[PDB]
Design a protein around this ligand. Structure first.
Ligand SMILES: O=C(CCCCCONC(=O)c1nc(-c2ccc(N3CCCC3)cc2)cs1)NO
Ligand SMILES: [Zn+2]
Ligand SMILES: [Zn+2]
Ligand SMILES: [Zn+2]
Ligand SMILES: [Zn+2]
Ligand SMILES: [Zn+2]
Length: 354
């Protein structure tokens, strides 16, 4: 009867860094977001979707059995061994609760996707950790263990039809390399990422994130990278990318389900991103995406490390999902226009609306 679903479970707080309790991927990222939804009176307006563990068979939709095996083995490791295993990846910490939390993150999003696709709710928001989009088929990376968003997209296909057109918009400030690679040869899933690039000087520090990686084989044109260079990007920049690139392509793709890899580390005040997108900015992005897929949008928390900025930003997205009017509203930075024009040029061969 509520149109918007919401999934949050404090067990996902159990994932922690044993050797640095102040690591930015904090447990209270999700609880602060949830707590803010309560303050802004959005929680009463949402249907509460239960969290569940993703099954191993569901993980296998995207991830190798080897990968699965290793992350599962972490459950019964001593601190010394957690430390060792952790340091085999780029930017990873592990606790005994990490695996459960990563399962909970994915399963929550599966339930949310199922609630949308069965008409229980129109749209949903997933306040989950740890994040997902850096997770490859074979490896963890960048605080991510499994690719929640990628898995949810496959889950959706498997409970509907395999050709179900799924759009993934990734506005985390980092490139979702794992998501890109998983669907790199897929024309049924459209990946669109905006991220700080700085010619590969920004994590995850690869040319994979550049505008010229457009997908492979059948997937040619179904991977859209929008890299930012030499600019403190904000609302004008993201609004322009949406108007010129994201929304035109998305409309032409005509998805049946929209998944947002919603990192809020492009927000003003975020220590890792150093960009200045506002909560109102994020609202207007959500609002625009809701014109797709009859409003069937699933917002999935990725990055974002300023507790105030992420709590405010994500609550605003939920407000849009609930059907509220956007809050109101600077000329575009040059380098942003350079970036946009490079992407227009690279994707003109695929999308006629460009
Ligand atoms: O978001 C993600 C995943 C993030 C993975 C990024 C790379 O791996 N790790 C990092 O960069 C880290 N950097 C910090 C850090 C940097 C700057 C500051 N500060 C600058 C000013 C003062 C405070 C504080 C903390 C902690 S770890 N995916 O979407
Ligand atoms: Zn309200
Ligand atoms: Zn991104
Ligand atoms: Zn693709
Ligand atoms: Zn591209
Ligand atoms: Zn990020």
């Amino acid at each position: 009867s509520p149109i918007t679903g919401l999934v949050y479970d404090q067990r996902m707080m159990l994932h922690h860094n044993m050797w640095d309790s102040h690591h930015p991927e904090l447990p209270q990222r999700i609880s602060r977001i949830f707590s803010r939804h309560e303050e802004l009176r959005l929680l009463s307006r949402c249907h509460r979707i239960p969290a569940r563990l993703a099954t191993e068979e569901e993980l296998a939709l995207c991830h190798s059995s080897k990968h699965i095996s290793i992350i599962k083995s972490s459950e019964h490791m001593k601190p010394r061994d957690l430390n060792r295993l952790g340091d085999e990846y780029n930017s990873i910490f592990i606790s005994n609760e990490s695996y459960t939390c990563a399962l909970l993150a994915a399963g929550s999003c599966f339930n949310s996707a199922q609630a949308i696709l069965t008409g229980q709710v129109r749209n949903a928001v997933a306040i989950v950790r740890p994040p997902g989009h850096h997770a490859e088929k074979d490896t963890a990376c960048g605080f991510c263990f499994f690719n929640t968003a990628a898995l949810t997209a496959r889950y959706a296909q498997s409970i509907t039809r395999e050709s179900l057109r799924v759009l993934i918009v990734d506005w985390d400030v980092h490139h979702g390399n794992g998501t890109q690679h998983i669907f790199e040869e897929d024309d049924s899933v459209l990946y669109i990422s905006l991220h700080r690039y700085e010619d590969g000087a920004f994590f995850p520090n690869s040319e994979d994130a550049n505008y010229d990686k457009v997908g492979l084989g059948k997937g040619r044109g179904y991977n859209v990278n929008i890299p930012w260079n030499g600019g403190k990007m904000g609302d004008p920049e993201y609004m322009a990318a949406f108007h010129h690139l994201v929304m035109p392509i998305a409309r032409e793709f005509a998805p049946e389900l929209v998944l947002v890899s919603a990192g809020f580390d492009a927000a003003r005040g975020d220590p890792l991103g150093g960009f200045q997108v506002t909560p109102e900015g994020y609202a207007h992005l959500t609002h625009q995406l809701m014109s797709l897929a009859a409003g069937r949008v699933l917002i999935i928390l990725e990055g974002g490390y300023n507790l105030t900025s992420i709590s405010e930003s994500m609550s605003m997205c939920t407000s849009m999902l609930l059907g509220d009017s956007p809050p109101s509203l600077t000329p575009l930075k040059t380098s942003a226009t350079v970036s946009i024009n490079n992407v227009l040029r690279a994707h003109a061969p695929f999308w006629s609306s460009l």
